[PDB]
Design a protein around this ligand. Sequence first.
Ligand SMILES: [Mn+2]
Ligand SMILES: [Mn+2]
Ligand SMILES: [Mn+2]
Length: 391
Amino acid sequence: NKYKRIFLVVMDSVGIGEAPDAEQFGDLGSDTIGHIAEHMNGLQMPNMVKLGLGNIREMKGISKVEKPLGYYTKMQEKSTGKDQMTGHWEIMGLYIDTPFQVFPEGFPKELLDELEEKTGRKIIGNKPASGTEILDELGQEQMETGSLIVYTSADSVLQIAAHEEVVPLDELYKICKIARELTLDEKYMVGRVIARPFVGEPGNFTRTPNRHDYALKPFGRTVMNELKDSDYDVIAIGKISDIYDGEGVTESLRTKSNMDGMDKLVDTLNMDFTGLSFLNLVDFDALFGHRRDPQGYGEALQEYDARLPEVFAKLKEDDLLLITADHGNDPIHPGTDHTREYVPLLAYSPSMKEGGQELPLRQTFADIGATVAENFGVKMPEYGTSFLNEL
Ligand SMILES: [Mn+2]
Ligand SMILES: [Mn+2]
Ligand SMILES: [Mn+2]
């Protein structure tokens, strides 16, 4: 093998400007990193700059360098959608025709009618809200009537809240499984159904750790599956295991924050393993992109950048570091959805003694999967073109 270990980092939602097909999505003008850089009066990301981020595209505070540490380019998304699962599934070698939906005005009556029809229970709420907001508003009615609080977020989720004393936990799980089946329908396709049991009294409701998630498996066997099947290590960090519903995963490390994500990445650098360590840094998307908070987003990017030199110091000659994103989520864009954008790609190993060069633009995110597959000698994905030989 050319590399013994590949460290793949998804900066979640960290897009590098509108894609050629942005108009279809209402995403003309979208530029996640660029708009953040303008807001910050210049982003301070010296380590990403050293890797060649400015060589992909110059932005405020982000300039090109003469000798980038590694190779650089951007990637274009080929799949129909701009959601979490589409982006990640494409990265690991798939092509996804059918996009996962978001519901800023709640779910269609048809879906909620069938859920009522199958459960014999009333549904209340039906809007995007935080757990705290929806329980403050509807928690008491839920307790008193035995109704189900159905809500969503800015992402592709259907969430069902019920008080543990009123709706038995096991009944809530059964209901969520029904909802999971009903939402395997391209009109109502949600990435994730989430059980949100809660306890307490009016004015003091808390969501319990009895939360359960109901995800869909990727629409195909991924490069992760192939790695696992060939007895390679596949270490998933953060939301990665959940995004792939555990498919191809050999170890999963939960994280609480971006900084904690970088700590677990460091933990994997300290592990003897052969295969893939795969990190998702989700805060960019979950805290700042959807909340349209360019200041928080900018600060988060600077906090992440400052962590990189330790990663650089720990990389071995036979290690490869890959840094990319899965879509955009421009914090100055209208609405609360993701934006259809190119994503950066940086590929660095200390064995690149002469530094890196520009790679041809990646025509699908699956080029990452193809590169991983070729490196480890496992079955090549149906989609994607490896850039391994270019490194
Ligand atoms: Mn838009
Ligand atoms: Mn994402
Ligand atoms: Mn998101």
